[model samples]
Target: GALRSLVLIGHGSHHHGESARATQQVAEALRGRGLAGHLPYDEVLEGYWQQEPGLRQVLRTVAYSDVTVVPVFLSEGYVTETVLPRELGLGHQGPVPTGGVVRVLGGRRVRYTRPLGAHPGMADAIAAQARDTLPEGTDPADVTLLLLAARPGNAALETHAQALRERGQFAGVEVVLESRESAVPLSEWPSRVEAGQAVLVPFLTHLGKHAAERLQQALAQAAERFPQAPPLHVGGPVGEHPAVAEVVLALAAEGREDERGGDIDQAHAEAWAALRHLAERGGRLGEVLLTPYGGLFELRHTLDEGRATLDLQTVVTPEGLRDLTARDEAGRWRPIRTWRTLPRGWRAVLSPADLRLGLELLYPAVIEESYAHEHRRLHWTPWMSTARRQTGTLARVQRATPDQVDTVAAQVCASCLRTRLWAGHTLGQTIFSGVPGGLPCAEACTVLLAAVRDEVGRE
Candidate 1:
């Protein structure tokens, strides 16, 4: 059987173009490695949260023998533990299928490697890059190397920074952490850079939007704040380095050698050890939570189960949400005055009011009507006749009669309003459209009446 490797790249977010571009560069590099002829190689697919070729779709679309999914991510988390396996149809711990296109899957035969940072040699690569940025005749002792990493949740960057310092490559090494999603305010960098001439290296695999723009802006701000500050020379991101590719290949080889147990523990331990060491040596370690309010929910700890508590210290409240909205030029709230009484029966009402209010408050640049229209097109419009098949709202009215549909709709609307406005905010203008001779009496009409009742009840 021919060896075919599928390099799976993660784009992470829809908003950032850099992440995808960086991964594409790595795929191109891999294809050029000459291993492509012996071991069939391809970029395979790109995965995203809001875009096409999602994980499930990616797996279904590509068929290859011995697929080596190289996760372009910096760490192991949901995508590694749950999403990847689920998409590949591999049971959590069960053996991968031995027959057909599904053969050699999961952690058993298929390999999931550590984020590129796990490799020890990366220290040398980083040190060499720093050395190149240093000025002529500058004593290594006087120059500081700073790894400004977009370390959202991993503490490993600090470990790598500390290792670089211990390597005696530079006078001092500091790991200043930030994130594209959520970062430390840029105001803090000027003081750090002023202390010494430093080489600012992005601890990212690729120089995506954040790395290219936001980081540059922060650097420029630092220079402006301290005109006489030691010259700060920025290096490119550390993506697809030969050393990093070696690490991935080593991980793949290890996966092939391990028969019974996967080396996930060892890989994580090594990576964390490096990160911890860096944190201890003047490297500030930090991670970004998915929600500005708190961390993401997982089966191990769910939002409702209290496994994940809102970090009140970091929680972005309604006032904070409003402030962010205002920062972007959003307007004030309005009242939703439309109302109607309905005859009892299974029926649905549609309304553009509540969604409009939600979007207005959440994303003000997008008008209420436009937001409502988009949501309807994505969520409700496609399933017009099959609306009842959906779960959230219609599920509540499953067995209700046409006369009872209005009441159910009202309750559903009330619940949604309470949840959305629970933090505080008034409802605005509403538009109701009802369907005749349909169960729930037209889902659109039920939705409209529901929104009206919710608005009145809240008032």
Candidate 2:
């Protein structure tokens, strides 16, 4: 098991028990799902800006080697722009300001994440919150979503609000930030409302600090000031919304990948350097490449030294072809003529052409068995396993990024209708098994459907 932790940073208050509870509930839910116990993180800890167990203080006590700090706020105002980065020692850039790696503490690496409210999940949560306060038959077109913020504005949170607008879930989606907490204050950056009734959604992680009550009550008073505008209905706080957990979990995954990026680069460079030393021997590349690599599983593989020992195993060909090359790399390969003339260590290596063809031959039996071994034996998720299988296809994978959600949605929707199942495990399950009788399990199907729909909702 890996020793990594998640630091959930929130703007908390000594007087706000509910504020702390909201942050903890998200953490607790993540822990309960074993999401925290996944390869990248072993635990999730809540840290506050204004309350006890503050972020800087808690960071010092984390026993894990790596920590991912996830901000629970919705925007990049005071807390995100100033207090958090300054307190967490996340450098000149605010925590996750660049959307890449930005923090290191001692020997441990700290990965900063974007605020929770910036995600698409937050948009849905806001819409869901607004809808909850409206009448049962209320038309979405009549409901305006007012995204009340504690700070002025943010590109990311504005993007999130835009997502709700894109969904056509409500007539209008607006953002209004309070310069200071007041039941009804001065600064207003043009909020949303229809000619009739609309729902006002507070875009905060927790209401414990009373920011929400102050904001909502102020909105009510402001409504009085503008009797001509639509009646604004106050909804529940954002923290209690279930999607809060999903948003945090998704960001945790993102942060883990960011933290992992540096480790992989360093490990690969070290491995390549060592291998290069052997390679410079002209034929000296350590046939036994004592190369360090964090394996592909959550990118958790680490080499004690900067090396890995890949044992040679003799194998037959998928009927060798003349058009292949097996350089010390993946190809478009250079095929081998005979193993007899090659060094014993070199004989074990095969061309990518050979391996790919061989894998094809092994598909139903050997490949499947080996895929099982990858996750079960190597202890990686099926997602990681599939990623590993896609050896030299990063370009293809990259191309698929923007529309993969559509692909998954279409495929998943097709599969769900044609098959009965349960599980959230694999996106590629459709490729492997769509047989009538042996459909994916119930949970798998449900999650696939939900994930696809929710992702669409996010878009």
Candidate 3:
């Protein structure tokens, strides 16, 4: 059970919580298929580079002996090279290997795969996206393909374009970087391509606020400036393509195969054993209580049996349990699972072996985080230190007064099950009662930082 873990690390946004949804969606897809197919994992968890369940936080909470982390990025640059390795504790310096990098930390074997941008299957995904976006009768030879990025200097983008060009699927493939307006700005991109007809796609993984808006603006400007040019079709970001999931699986399979199959970590084994104890023999953890029924375990909310029976939903396996809680009642995607909005009244009956999987799926990483908090082993990232680390728009959060931080904390932390260990104050015990012992929040989360920015902006 402690053999391996798979994690998809995404560039989550503090201002836009939904930005991380793409990574979550990919993880869910993998979780469903891995369990249903030959490629099963001990656990499939997701974390973020910028938002809640931060990369390092996720590593601390993982219960497996072997962890394979795949960065859901279009290209491997500063994030994959410098920031990720630093936060992941691979080493103090040096670029990550193109194939992947592996190291041992705290007895756990951790593996970091090259970002999706380096995967060979990514070219196929881009081509698939281009074909899907192109007009049905459009001829590939008659149209050029353009990959647009906000900033220049991406060798990965150039490599993909070269691969596409060699295939002769389109007249040509070009990579366009948004001109730095501070310098001499470049002209419209349509004039730069060989063919009048073309397809353009964002050279980014996730099309969050800035990238999405910038893509639209660029598309509009190109059309406005070149009215006589042939049609230009717009494709979604390469990271959003369905085929990207397949590429992730391929990377994961390759990375796992490359592992040494070394003995499992005893520390991780003991930690997981302790975690399982919280759910052993009618034990309660978080909203779920693992109760013995017949020979199986019935996972129910902390509510009495009658209250739990009021709902018609019943899941028999961990997959089904994941599907039930995949979305909230409002039908919105849930990137962050610990939100108090977890689907209520649903029940699951699973085998003893599946009990841990079911609970982990329902409340990912909480068991480990809670256990650490209780043992006083959890480390807290201070409010000021976390604030200084902010960049871009969120950097303004440093200007917020203590009163502003308190108001935002109360409003935002109210809906979350994790206690803000970094806030120097705890959430109301009544509201956090759903969690047996609230999950530890080692740092001020992206949501809280975003909220603090909002509070400061009011000034």
Return the top candidate by TM-score.
Answer: 3
CA lDDT of each prediction against the hidden true structure = 0.41, 0.48, 0.71
Off by over 4 Å in 3: 14-18, 36-42, 134-139, 177-197, 226-228, 249-258, 263-284, 287-357, 375-415, 420-439, 449-459
Task: After superposing candidate 2 on the true structure, give the runs of residues whose Cα lies further than 4 Å from its correct spot.
Answer: 35-40, 93-95, 177-196, 208-231, 255-459
Worst 10 residues of 2 by lDDT: 295-304
- Count of backbone collisions in candidate 1: 33
Tell me the deviation in Å of residue 60 in model 2: 3.9
Error of 2 at 35 (Å): 8.2
What is the per-residue lDDT of model 3 for residues 213-235, given as tens digits with 9 covering 90 to 100? 66667667876887776677878
Per-model tally of clashing residue pairs: 33, 31, 0
Worst 10 residues of 3 by lDDT: 178-187
Give a tens-digit lDDT track for model 1, residues 1-459.
Answer: 343445555644323445544555554455457334532342233443222234433332332334555556554555554545554444443222212122354332455444455556567667766666666776766677777766554555666776876777576776765534433344355565435577776767677654577777776766677767776677776664544555555544444432232223232233334323332332211110111112211111111222223322121222222222221112221111011111111111112222212222232211222223222421221113323432333344334444453444446545222112211222232211211110111123333333433443443
TM-score of each prediction: 0.47, 0.48, 0.75
Candidate 1 TM-score to native: 0.47
lDDT-best of 2 and 3: 3
Candidate 2 residue-wise lDDT, 1-459, digit = tens = 245677787766523346555776776677566633443455556667654345444554354557778888777655676557765667644445435455677556787777776666777777777777888788878766777665664566677777877888777777766554322232332233436566667666666435656665665666566756665577777777877888787776753454332222232223234323432332211112212223210110112122233432233343221112122122221111111111222122334323323222211121222222223321222322222222222213322333654467456545222222112333232211221112122212212333444554555
After superposing candidate 1, which stretches have Cα over 4 Å from the reference? 12-16, 35-52, 61-63, 90-109, 128-142, 178-196, 207-213, 240-243, 258-459
